[PDB]
Amino acid sequence: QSVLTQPPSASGTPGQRVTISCSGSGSNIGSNTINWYQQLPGTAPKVLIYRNNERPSGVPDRFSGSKSGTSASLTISGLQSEDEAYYHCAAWDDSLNGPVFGGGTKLTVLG
């Protein structure tokens, strides 16, 4: 139902790199930066990436974000057991003149 579309659940082996996609139009993705939030199951969401390039110090280097035109990709990388979380892509929207968010992807840690 969200304006920004994300995969429902992406899984990967521990150590592997997992890519989460966020697709939309240039009004909110092209015109405004994409950011990625993560919330662990049962916990309040913590900032992962904001403005696509900087991170809040604690985040390890594996988490990176890229924005190309109307698309965005967050390569989580270095999959660990605690990666399992809901991932949301967020951006300002000029048509709605407010924050809009993605559908959310459930990261899964495989055996």
């Binding site: 405004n32 930066t33 403005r51 300002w92």
Partner: protein, 49 residues
């Protein structure tokens, strides 16, 4: 800022025109209509700030 700065404030309602170099800290609601009001903002009195 990216969100669009909203913190800066300006007063649009005042009981008189201040002389040069005046500052006021109280931001009590300024009454516009004839009926006085007390407490919170409402009819005939809006927030000056």
């Amino acid at each position: 800022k990216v969100s669009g700065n909203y913190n800066y404030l300006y007063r649009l309602f005042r009981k008189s025109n201040l002389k040069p170099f005046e500052r006021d800290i109280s931001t009590e609601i300024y009454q516009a209509g004839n009926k006085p009001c007390n407490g919170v903002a409402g009819f005939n009195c809006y927030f000056p700030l």
